[PDB]
């Protein structure tokens, strides 16, 4: 047959690329030698096209102007701190080791100094649980207990823009506008609605996947469609 849509994606042609030339910046934590002698002033609040959430423009002492992944509650004028000796307050960044257990954190690093990888989406937050000299335990938004180097930097507070998902798009047009700001091909034609030549589920008088949808993990691309290595399906049991 012909390659399925999932395979066209991989080629990275314009149709499937994100509008990177329109994205602002990558809210990665600042790099400080040591001391925490770094503080900046929130100069403005902006809209981040790549995340549909607000971002805070900050001006640091040493003269560096950079956008930051803002938690909820940060406003113009406010002063933020970044470093080991940073004050324990919303909007400030410091290594987990300095954060007190039971404090909601966001933009958590996976490996000390990487800039932040976890809990960066609207209204989410990781929960710092256990402390130690060898391992900091964090409960990520998915509910998973993650073991991180106490040296991994993070920001206090939850990510700005919470509740974004509570309002329905209501119309295709609204979905449309949002999709135009992401690396995604939309709308979506169902596999069962295509010709046999175009998808494993295509073909047949009436629409239906003439086969079980739960596909094996070992399936090759082009065949791995439907419910990938499902441990179970449905709502029952």
């Amino acid at each position: 047959g012909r390659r399925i849509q999932g395979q066209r994606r991989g080629r990275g042609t314009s149709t499937f690329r994100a509008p990177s030339h329109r994205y602002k910046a990558d809210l990665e934590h600042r790099k400080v030698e040591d001391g925490d002698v770094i503080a900046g002033t929130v100069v403005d609040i902006e809209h981040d096209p790549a995340r549909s959430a607000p971002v805070a423009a900050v001006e640091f002492e040493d003269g560096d102007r950079r956008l930051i992944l803002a938690p909820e509650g940060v406003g113009v004028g406010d002063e933020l701190q970044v470093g080991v000796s940073a004050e324990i307050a919303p909007g400030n960044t410091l290594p987990l080791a300095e954060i007190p257990e039971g404090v909601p954190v966001c933009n958590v690093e996976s490996s000390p100094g990487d800039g932040g990888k976890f809990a960066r989406a609207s209204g989410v937050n990781a929960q710092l649980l256990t402390h130690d000299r060898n391992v900091a335990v964090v409960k990520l938004p998915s509910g998973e207990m993650k073991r991180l180097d106490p040296q991994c930097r993070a920001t206090i507070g939850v990510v700005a823009g919470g509740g974004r998902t509570d309002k329905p798009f209501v119309k295709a047009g609204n979905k449309h506008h949002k999709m135009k700001a992401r690396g995604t091909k939309w709308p979506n034609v169902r596999g069962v609605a295509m010709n046999a030549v175009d998808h494993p589920f295509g073909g047949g008088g009436r629409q239906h996947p003439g086969k079980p949808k739960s596909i094996s993990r070992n399936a090759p691309p082009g065949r791995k469609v439907g419910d990938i290595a499902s441990k179970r399906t449905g709502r029952g049991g």
Binding site: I45, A70, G75, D78, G123, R164
Partner: peptide, 9 residues
């Protein structure tokens, strides 16, 4: 005062 908050609240 310009600040960050929820998406609708």
């Amino acid at each position: 005062y310009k600040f960050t908050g929820g998406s609708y609240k």
